[PDB]
Amino acid sequence: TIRQNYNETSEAGVNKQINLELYASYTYLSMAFYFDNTTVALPGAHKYFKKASDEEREHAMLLMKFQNQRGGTIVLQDIKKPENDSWGSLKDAVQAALALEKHVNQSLLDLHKLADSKGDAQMCDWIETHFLTEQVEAIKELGDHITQLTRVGPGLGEYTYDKENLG
Amino acid sequence: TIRQNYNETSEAGVNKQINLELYASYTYLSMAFYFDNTTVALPGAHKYFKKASDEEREHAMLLMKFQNQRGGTIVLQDIKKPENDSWGSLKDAVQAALALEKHVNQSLLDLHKLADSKGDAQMCDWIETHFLTEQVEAIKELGDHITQLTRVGPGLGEYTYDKENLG
Amino acid sequence: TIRQNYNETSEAGVNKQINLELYASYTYLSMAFYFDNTTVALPGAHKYFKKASDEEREHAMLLMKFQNQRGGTIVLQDIKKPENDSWGSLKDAVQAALALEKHVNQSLLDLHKLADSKGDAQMCDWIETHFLTEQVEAIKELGDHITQLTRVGPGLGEYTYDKENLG
Amino acid sequence: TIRQNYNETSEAGVNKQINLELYASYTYLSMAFYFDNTTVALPGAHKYFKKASDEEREHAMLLMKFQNQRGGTIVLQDIKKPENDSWGSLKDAVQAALALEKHVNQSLLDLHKLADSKGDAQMCDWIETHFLTEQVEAIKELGDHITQLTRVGPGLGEYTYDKENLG
Amino acid sequence: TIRQNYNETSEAGVNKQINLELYASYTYLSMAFYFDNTTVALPGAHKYFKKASDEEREHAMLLMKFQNQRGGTIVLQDIKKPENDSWGSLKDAVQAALALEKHVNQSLLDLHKLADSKGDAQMCDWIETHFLTEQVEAIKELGDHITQLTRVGPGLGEYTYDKENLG
Amino acid sequence: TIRQNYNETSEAGVNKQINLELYASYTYLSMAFYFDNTTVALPGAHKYFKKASDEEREHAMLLMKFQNQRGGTIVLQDIKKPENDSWGSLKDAVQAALALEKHVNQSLLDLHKLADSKGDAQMCDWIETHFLTEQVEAIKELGDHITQLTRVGPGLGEYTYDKENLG
Amino acid sequence: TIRQNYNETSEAGVNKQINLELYASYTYLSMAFYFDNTTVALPGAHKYFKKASDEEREHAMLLMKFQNQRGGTIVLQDIKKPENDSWGSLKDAVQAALALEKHVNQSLLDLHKLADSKGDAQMCDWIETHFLTEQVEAIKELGDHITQLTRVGPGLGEYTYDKENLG
């Protein structure tokens, strides 16, 4: 028996977070191959969102590893398909990415609060170490991308930011 | 318009195969982190099924690429959770993997037969090139693993085959 | 006598394909040096279409090699001059290239169907191996170029895509 | 006067933890040389617990350094002899190691909770940075070893795990 | 049970092809050591047909591997001795080699047609990948050797071609 | 909008800490060039406090970065001149440095307590990660320097400690 | 307007020479793959005439470049198929090559005389620099090959000269 100071509600919250990271991974996968579609043809955004999809899947696997380390049980659920089939302009897709990452961030802060209320000091620091600052940096980066995509405008500007920044 | 000799039924079959490969990826992820649970503790199988998950996700992404190359439209669906939460012995899990890969193979052979019925010579060769022989080799490897896992037996044999072969 | 399972209609079709690959080579040669003309002055497109002309000539020579390998007789015909003397905007030229490659692709699929109907298993696989997937990738690339050339627009955008992508 | 925001109960708790880490070091030293005894003769376990003894002495020294950093005073007490003179089977010893590390983990969580109740933000973070996650990983590793030692069984299994994993 | 979409007539055909490849290996071994005989003394042909014998044994082993991969059973038969004890001139032996490889090519095309009639897409592709184009190239090479051996003529020509081309 | 879980009082406290770190930077610059004055002439202390000034300016810039990352607004104020024009003995200056760093530490602990009262888990961890332990180590080092400067005494000792330790 | 001292008759003569060089390229391609036919089987001549084809295509492209550099307009015409389908002996083919190169040389000398009659000093030097001496050296080499092919004779000599000189 390795389980120690690990509440069953914290365990359920970790299972929930696993599914949300997988959901995010699959949303970015959808975004990546939308930009690979020949009617869209933005190869930098294809690469950028494919990497984001890999990173979110890494996040899901960090949480599954944590679930095992603390002596919980991983319980998987369906991965819901992304909210959209097509994602509009490059700026639209980055705006939807920012919305998703803020939603993931709120869920991580709720998970942290839950852990804190059960006195789970190791879990709180683990979430801070691997997630909370990473999420703040990702949100800042996407916000910067949105301001730049606004500045450069549609057409030539979108092509340029795709190739010179996202690629 | 890049689409040429690409049937709408073939396109839908590719979208079905994308979902099936993702389901396989998620089943192997489940298996991998089952073997990371402290009550199972088989690190070779954890590494082996984690790589199998990565490979099936690559398979899904090859099909997404092909969908775009031929001028179809990727349509994603929910990724259903794996059939089990826990996977029993190492032999049980390899047996479950064999059954899944044979299911995926029958799906690929049906997709090949469909593409052939619509005269899609490039699609047929593409499935042969990337999938049909890879699948036969995967099934042969899994069957060999099952025979070796039967030979070495439970207990010390399972530990040994996990570490010396799968890891 | 090396000839075996090689139908005389398949042989005629290979001679036809040789001439069409040479025709394509000469159309891309025309395109390349149109963009070298001082009133056009797009050096990236000059390079890009000169390479395409070399590649189509390589294709013609692969087919002549195949004709000899199977024991047929190469019969050459006039290479018709390209359809146009000048090719308009960079987007116009890439659109004409896409139209030509789809026409070449349809001819390759007809050649494959002909071979299949005569039971020429080696010829079918040879066409799949060297041509059918290459043609799908070339058609996808040109379609992507057209979407990007539309996105970036005339003037500065055309200059930029010429230098940063086609060059 | 460097002392700042450092409670004297926190300071007394750090002194208690120093003694517990030294007690753990000395328990693992006992175990290590039990496995070096000719009637036991498990060289992998000897090396593994010798390293564990070194690491626990490092932990004690980290806490002594921290006591000095915060302007407290180190106060040493007798290091109690280990609970047993001989440690049974390899599995028996890893089970006693797991019990000990859970006791040390509970002590660390109590020390953290004490620091938190006195508003010692830096001491809380220091315990998280150096101990809490290290302790969770050590406990998971020991649990995994117990599961594998059960799987391989006595005799040849014990010999094999000792040589191939612990050593 | 790894067997899937593998017809027992296909399996019996693979066993037949194994024996034919072994028969070809043994014919080329005969030829190779005929040219090593002191009354013949053509060292280039000795090396060339020894290599051909090795390659045909490799072909047999590829087919045995395939039989196992698809879940069939290898069934071996006597390897018949070669049709002749001595092989005449160098040109004579290359002519007999050409006749043999055309017979093997017809066997491979029949095996492919059989697999195709049972819907064995993977077996058809496997034969194309490993045999059909290799066989066309081997036949072209042998035909070219016969033409050059005719051109150089008997005596000094035979000596020269043996040393400079076959060797 | 990137701002999430970032309280306006926390934001104002970060602007206060930016100014305080800049004040510390400027105090250390004053000290550094006091020790460069020909009537003082302690080159080790000049180098030591110049680096301390660089480090506190880096601290201010880390907080400016954090303000932007969380979606706050940097608001700068006057940097007040240091408390003294001349700093007495080397021991006097290290004593003045210790008092300043303890003041900065109390400011950081108050900022941490404020962020904690508003549930800002990421800010709390960020202050722990970048400041709280760095501050404890800085205070410990300064206290040690003061004890050594007392031990070595004025005159030759001050010269020696300046050159051999601070420089 | 870059055009200067470039006569319209000279421009038309350059367009005529572009077509003639392309006709030569295609004649050499025909010859090259005649020698690759299994009933001819001379690999040195295949390589030699394939390179000659590449070189004449380079010649055409040099003239296209020159047309653009001087501010003319490239106008392409049909490339007539070669005069023969089969080229007889190796000596016959080199003899046909010599006659073609002398025809091309007379065309170049006529183009030079025309440029000279219009006072086009740069064009005259350009034809001298790139063509007139290259042509004399090509004709000398072909004449030497014909004398050597006469010396070595049919049969073994033709094989030897093909391999040792042309290849």
Author numbering:
A (entry chain B), B (entry chain H), C (entry chain B), D (entry chain A), E (entry chain A), F (entry chain H), ...: 3 to 169
Quote the authors verbatim.
Ferritin is the main iron storage protein in most living organisms, playing a key role in iron homeostasis and detoxification. Canonical ferritin is composed of 24 subunits, which self-assemble into a quasi-spherical nanocage with an outer diameter of ~12 nm and an interior diameter of ~8 nm. Thereafter, we introduced a self-assembling strategy by designing π–π stacking interactions at the shared protein interfaces involved in two different kinds of 3D protein nanocage superlattices, which is referred to as key protein interface redesign (KPIR).
The protein subunit contains 171 amino acids and has a molecular weight of about 19.36 kDa. Notably, different from the crystal structure of other reported ferritin, AfFer exhibited a BCT lattice arrangement in its crystals. The C4 interface of this ferritin molecule forming the subface is perfectly aligned by virtue of Pro156, with weak van der Waals forces that provide assistance for the stability of the BCT lattice. Since only one out of three subunits constituting the C3 interface is involved in the formation of electrostatic interactions, the dislocation between the C3 interfaces of the ferritin molecules results in the lack of crystallographic three-fold symmetry; consequently, AfFer forms BCT rather than a BCC lattice. Notably, this BCT lattice differs from most reported ferritin molecules, which are packed in a FCC fashion along the C2 interface in their crystals.
